[PDB]
Design an enzyme around this catalytic site. Structure first.
Site, short mmCIF file in Angstrom:
data_model
loop_
_atom_site.label_atom_id
_atom_site.label_comp_id
_atom_site.label_asym_id
_atom_site.label_seq_id
_atom_site.Cartn_x
_atom_site.Cartn_y
_atom_site.Cartn_z
N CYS B 107 0.87 -1.17 0.00
CA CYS B 107 0.00 0.00 0.00
C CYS B 107 0.92 1.23 0.00
CB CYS B 107 -0.96 -0.06 1.18
SG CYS B 107 -2.09 1.32 1.31
N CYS B 110 -0.91 4.52 1.93
CA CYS B 110 -1.59 4.62 3.23
C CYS B 110 -1.78 3.37 4.09
CB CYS B 110 -2.97 5.23 3.00
SG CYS B 110 -4.06 4.21 1.99
N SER B 111 -0.85 2.41 4.06
CA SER B 111 -0.77 1.32 5.05
C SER B 111 -1.91 0.30 4.99
CB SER B 111 -0.71 1.87 6.48
OG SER B 111 0.63 1.98 6.91
N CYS B 112 -2.67 0.25 3.89
CA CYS B 112 -3.79 -0.69 3.75
C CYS B 112 -3.36 -2.12 4.03
CB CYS B 112 -4.36 -0.65 2.33
SG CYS B 112 -4.05 0.70 1.23
#
Lengths: 228, 203
Positions: B107, B110-112
């Site tokens: 991601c 944003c750290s998905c």
């Protein structure tokens, strides 16, 4: 927005730091920062897209090197001020108090069971972002499309490394909350969502792996037809 | 990496601790946060939700061709058959490693991460070093960082998770495991193998 958090393809960030083992939470403050998300979401500080936009507005040097959950603290304060729910002067006074009195107790409060019931329902029920819309998808598997060159200053999911690039539609997922509106306080405005495949050579030129592709998710306004 | 401008880790933690406790005290006084709410979230993601759940899904797909078909067609619905689902896995899509294709998930924005099957992401996955490099030189990153050599003639598909779709890798079943029980097979399935940065465990 074109911030430093949009790191795909950036060079020079250094080697991966991957300890051979790590706990889920590295310190007690991390548990607090993590658990604040359902509290502030339920209280109307922000939705998910707005949450991410708050992180994107961090000082870029702070973003690159601060502990992950500190980013969450920054976006809670950002939206607390935005909504008038956090008084900064009071927050700064309380910070100095807990600097000087780190073991002082937290305020007296009731352990409202409905807040825990909320946590349990969210965790195991989810918060689906899929939405029904009036129209069929404009695109379908196999369509060749080009990604927008728009560069909005507000929240979006338009990584610089895919802008203007041509790829092939892989899958239509249905319609979902649109980040370009939701993250900027403009509502869900749902749009059809697609996975689009871009070859490494399309993305990176000749320095591209001839046998690699990147699959990137594109809401319908992001892409326009090249060839059916 | 060295930054001559940066405070010590101890001073950084001390300051963060006070800022977090201050914000916590304000939200408690607003009535929207409680210490029991905090403890519940930590218990869930320390003990109840983690990669052992995804491992159960993988081993069922390895041992039940009809379930594997449902998993690849609708990951959320198939995982719900096992009582697995929820926050940040509302829309799961599983992708199958084969002799011709290798999948890796990132991601970049944003750290998905698919919490219901893997728990919270490890810190390296959230950090800019992995995120910047894997979309640009995945073959070299896999080799140099994870000791995982994907032959140059084999396609690497990098899934950059820019939406609420959550991509989970179904790794190939290691050789030498014919007739193994589902419990024995699960010992080979790691969170790394479901991100795609490692294969499932050999031997």
């Amino acid at each position: 927005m074109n911030g430093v958090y949009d790191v795909g393809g950036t060079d020079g960030l250094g080697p991966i730091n991957r300890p051979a083992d790590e706990p889920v939470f590295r310190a007690e403050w991390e548990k607090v920062a993590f658990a604040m998300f359902p509290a502030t979401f339920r209280a109307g500080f922000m939705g998910l897209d707005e949450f991410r936009f708050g992180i994107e507005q961090m000082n870029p040097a702070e973003y690159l090197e601060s502990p992950y959950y500190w980013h969450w603290i920054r976006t809670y304060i950002h939206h607390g001020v935005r909504t008038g729910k956090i008084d900064l002067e009071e927050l700064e006074r309380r910070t100095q108090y807990y600097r000087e009195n780190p073991d002082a107790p937290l305020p007296e409060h009731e352990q409202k069971p409905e807040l825990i019931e909320f946590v349990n329902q969210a965790v195991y029920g989810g918060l689906p972002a899929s939405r029904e819309v009036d129209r069929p998808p404009k695109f379908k598997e196999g369509d060749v499309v080009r990604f927008s060159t728009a560069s909005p200053k507000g929240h979006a999911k338009r990584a610089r490394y895919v802008r203007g690039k041509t790829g092939t539609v892989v899958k239509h997922h249905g319609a979902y909350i649109y980040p370009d509106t939701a993250g900027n306080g403009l509502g869900e405005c749902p749009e059809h969502l697609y996975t689009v495949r871009f070859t490494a050579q399309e993305l990176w030129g000749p320095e591209g792996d001839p046998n690699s592709s990147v699959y990137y998710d594109c809401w319908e306004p992001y892409i326009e037809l090249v060839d059916t | 990496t060295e930054n001559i401008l940066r405070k010590s880790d101890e001073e950084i933690q001390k300051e963060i601790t006070a800022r977090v406790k201050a914000l916590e005290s304000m939200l408690i006084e607003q009535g929207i946060l409680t210490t029991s709410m905090i403890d519940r979230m930590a218990e869930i993601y320390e003990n109840e939700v983690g990669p052992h759940l995804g491992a159960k899904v993988v081993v069922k797909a390895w041992t039940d061709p009809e379930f594997k078909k449902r998993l690849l067609a609708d990951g959320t619905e198939a995982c719900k058959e096992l009582g697995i689902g929820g926050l940040q896995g509302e829309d799961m899509m599983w992708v199958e490693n084969t002799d011709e294709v290798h999948h890796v998930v990132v991601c970049t924005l944003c750290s998905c991460y698919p919490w219901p099957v893997l728990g919270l992401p490890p810190n390296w996955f959230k950090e800019p070093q992995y995120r910047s490099r894997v979309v640009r030189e995945p073959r070299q990153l896999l080799k140099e960082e994870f000791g995982f050599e994907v032959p140059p003639s084999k396609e690497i598909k990098v899934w950059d998770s820019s939406s609420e779709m959550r991509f989970v890798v179904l790794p190939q079943r290691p050789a030498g495991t014919d007739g193994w029980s589902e419990e024995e097979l699960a010992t080979l399935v790691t969170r790394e193998s479901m991100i795609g940065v490692e294969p499932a465990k050999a031997v």
